[PDB]
Structure formats: structure tokens, C-alpha cells
Design a protein around this ligand. Sequence first.
Ligand code: HEC
Ligand code: HEC
Ligand code: ASC
Ligand code: ASC
Lengths: 127, 127
Amino acid sequence: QFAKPEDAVKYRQSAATLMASHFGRMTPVVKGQAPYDAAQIKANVEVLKTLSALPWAAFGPGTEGGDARPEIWSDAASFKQKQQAFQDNIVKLSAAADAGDLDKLRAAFGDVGASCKACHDAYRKKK
Amino acid sequence: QFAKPEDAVKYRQSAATLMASHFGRMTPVVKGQAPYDAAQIKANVEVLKTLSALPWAAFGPGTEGGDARPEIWSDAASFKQKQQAFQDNIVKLSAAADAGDLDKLRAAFGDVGASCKACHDAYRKKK
Ligand code: HEC
Ligand code: HEC
Ligand SMILES: O=C1O[C@H]([C@@H](O)CO)C(O)=C1O
Ligand SMILES: O=C1O[C@H]([C@@H](O)CO)C(O)=C1O
């Protein structure tokens, strides 16, 4: 869907920005600093679910640029595993949110976070 | 969810970027220049549905900035109508995509487009 590689860069960075907001906005809830409303969280995690599937199609062949490390493309199987682990952890978060269980939510949230960070540590350029 | 107004600006502009991609990528299909795969379009419009609901919560009080015209806030009822008309047109697009009817899809797509443009013409600063 991208006319130039710059377009794929812009897309994935915007998807990431939205992921970051929908993930990170739950921090006060999982820490107990904001109230836990199960329905609010269930709806927000549904949004995060959708967003979570979006970036990966914008690292298509030839879309090198931004803060994407070239190893995304030369180590494609390894990058796919990081992405799939992340998306699997999103499924678990969806289950925790759907169950309405704050304990489970905080543990699932921590697993998602660690998956975001694992990928960045390997495949995102230092800033 | 935004620590500073700049954060809401960044969020809404990223949501818009994603909307633009998920909307605009269907142009070749509605024009007949790319093949129409009903399932592909149904799935893409589902993504657009989700995205389409996101920007409006990031024009909260005090989030003036970016290319948002101040009239968004001083004419709140009028801006809400533009947004609701847009979202209603997204519903119609969802129905057309769900029905698998290219005729209906192209007419619904044109209505959504016109709603995007109507809002921009009133509430987005010239660039
Ligand atoms: C690899 C499988 C990743 C996972 C999982 C996550 N992110 Fe990511 N992120 C990744 C890359 C390769 C990049 C760089 C993209 C580029 O071309 O520059 C990013 C970038 C971000 C950013 C910065 C985006 C920007 O606006 O420039 C953010 C804020 C970000 N990523 C957040 C984020 C979160 C919250 C994740 C888990 C919920 C997450 N990423 C997962 C690679 C991967
Ligand atoms: C009012 C109800 C709007 C509707 C409906 C749509 N858009 Fe929008 N858009 C709106 C505003 C007020 C702004 C400016 C936001 C800011 O703070 O700068 C925008 C911006 C865009 C942009 C540019 C985003 C950027 O990256 O800077 C795009 C590409 C855009 N809008 C696209 C778009 C599309 C495709 C829409 C219909 C599917 C659409 N917008 C609707 C206000 C409104
Ligand atoms: O909110 C975020 O969480 C991850 C990471 O910090 C979790 O450790 C990330 O990169 C964000 O923007
Ligand atoms: O793809 C887009 O469609 C609308 C508008 O051009 C429709 O007229 C818009 O602002 C986009 O980015």
C-alpha cells in the first residue's frame, strides 16, 4: 500500500505511536494508581489487539529506513519470531482483559512489555 | 492518556496517518485498477472501522496545536456533527464491505471521502 519506502516508514512509526499510547496508558491501572474498570480495559485492549497486528506488514521488502535495523530483513525468521511472540502475548493480554482479572492483567501486561522491549533491543536503532 | 498536549497532537496525527493509509489504499480497487477480493476489503474496512473511532478522543480540552483549527473547540457541537457524520459513513462502508458488493463499496467509499474532506475544509489549518 506504500508508494515509496518513506511511506512504509511513516506508517509503521504511526502504528507504533498508537501502540505505545494504548499500551502505556494502562500503566497506572496495572500499578493500582488508577481505578480498574474491567469493561474500560477490555475495550482498550481490543483496540490494542487491532493495532498490534499492523506494523509488521510495513516492514516489507525494500522498506529499509527509519530506526529499523537492516537485520530485520537479513534475519527475517528471527524478526518474525519476535513479532509472533509479541502477538501471542497480546492474545494472552486479550484473555486477561476479557476475564476481568486484575492479577492476570498485570502479569500479561508485563509479558507484552517485555516482548516490545526484546524486539526493540534487537531490531531498533539506538536513539 | 496524554501527559502534555503535544502528546495528543502526536496521537491524532498518527491515527490520521493510519486512516489515510487504510482508506486511500482502496482507491485502486474502487476504481477497478486493482482486483476486488471481497474478503480482503472486508478485513481492511474492519481495520479502518477501528481506526476511524480513534482521533476524536485526542481533541480533548486543552489539546490545541498541530493543524487543528481552534474552532474545533469553540464550535464543539459543529465539530461533533462532522465527526458523527464521518463515523456514520464508516458504518455504511462496513455494510458495503460486509455485503461484498463493489457498486455499493464504491458509492460508500466516495461518501466517506467526502466526509473526511468536509471536516478538513472546516477544521484543519491550510498547509
Ligand atoms: C519487533 C517485533 C517489534 C515489536 C514486538 C515492537 N516493536 Fe516497536 N518498533 C519496532 C521497530 C523495528 C521500530 C522502528 C520503526 C522505524 O522504522 O523507525 C519500532 C518503533 C517503535 C516506536 C517509535 C515509533 C516512532 O514514532 O518513531 C515506539 C514508540 C514503539 N516501537 C513502541 C512499541 C510498543 C509499545 C510495543 C509493544 C506494545 C512495540 N513497539 C513492539 C519493532 C517492534
Ligand atoms: C473531523 C471530524 C475530521 C474527519 C472526519 C477527518 N479528519 Fe483527518 N484531520 C482532522 C484534523 C482536525 C486534523 C489535524 C490534526 C492535527 O492536530 O494536526 C486532521 C489531520 C489529518 C491528516 C494529517 C495528519 C498528520 O499526519 O499530520 C490526514 C492524512 C488526515 N487527517 C486524513 C483523514 C482521512 C483519510 C479521513 C477520512 C477517512 C479523515 N482525516 C477524517 C479532522 C478530521
Ligand atoms: O509503552 C511502551 O512499552 C514498551 C517498553 O518500554 C516496555 O518495556 C515501549 O517501547 C513503549 O513505548
Ligand atoms: O485518503 C484520503 O482521503 C481524504 C480526502 O482526500 C478525500 O477527499 C484524505 O484527506 C486523505 O488522506
